[PDB]
């Protein structure tokens, strides 16, 4: 039952915090698919994505609580949640190709960030399912570079 679980961790700031957090998965030999974090004020919120069993998760999600400077930890993956990814891509765009790719961006509600005759930068945002659909569409175009944030998430407040 390999599954692509997601954990969210809330912390007080110190130098080397990402290195303590990344050590618990490296000690298993487990793989982080994606991780995103930004220091909000005095505190920070991770969202991270990993591949494995729900058994071994109970170990690594317990062992994260032993750290003196973790505030809260949750497995968010089963709960009703807001979930989004930002992706940014640069693609070659010959004047003709410029014609069809315009139809695509005009579909996905994408924005163009800058222009050059050889390539364009596009900003894409939404649910991960739209992200994969986009990737399968861009497959037919000469990509130049791509980068993406990994899924951010927050629980929906039921009454």
């Amino acid at each position: 039952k390999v599954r692509k679980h997601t954990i969210s961790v809330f912390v007080g700031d110190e130098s080397g915090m990402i290195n303590r957090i990344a050590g618990v998965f490296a000690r298993r030999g487990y793989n982080i698919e994606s991780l995103a974090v930004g220091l909000n004020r005095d505190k920070a919120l991770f969202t991270i994505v990993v591949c494995g069993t729900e058994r071994v998760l109970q170990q690594v999600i317990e062992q994260l609580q032993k750290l003196v400077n973790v505030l809260k930890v949750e497995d968010i993956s089963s709960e009703p949640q807001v979930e989004r990814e930002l992706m940014l891509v640069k693609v070659n765009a010959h004047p003709e190709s410029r014609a069809e790719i315009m139809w695509l961006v005009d579909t996905f509600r994408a924005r163009v960030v800058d222009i050059a005759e050889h390539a364009l930068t596009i900003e894409v945002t939404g649910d991960p399912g739209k992200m994969i659909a986009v990737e399968r569409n861009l497959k037919k175009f000469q990509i130049r570079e791509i980068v993406r944030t990994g899924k951010i998430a927050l629980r929906r407040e039921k009454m």
Binding site: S15, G23, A26
Partner: protein
Amino acid sequence: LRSHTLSLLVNDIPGVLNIVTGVFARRGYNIQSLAVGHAETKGISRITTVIPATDESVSKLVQQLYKLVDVHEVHDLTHLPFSERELMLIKIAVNAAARRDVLDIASIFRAKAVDVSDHTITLQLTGDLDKMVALQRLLEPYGICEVARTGRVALARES
């Protein structure tokens, strides 16, 4: 000091993020935001990070990073021309009357609503750090619950 942006490509071995974050933590530098995700090809990930440093010290740190076996390449972007974006989710405790006021600010920032309860609402925003902090500073009068920032993502523009 002044803030800098690094973009790194890594050989995507399980546990490699612990090797890289160990280099910064051994210099003591406090990473203010980090994002890691799949690059343009199977078998490579990109890491992007913001650090307070000197443009002398980053030159020493990028030389230092080349000693790692699992980096493919490393760039400072700070002195180059580069496009930049950032994603934020925010949750707010709000009553039906204040909901009006908040929707006004959202409309001004071109923020998209994405969760609602008569207890609380959450907004999605994309842009750059100045609009981020401006918004987070303006919504202080209301019970701001949490902020799931991605950290920046960037690409150089060849133009």
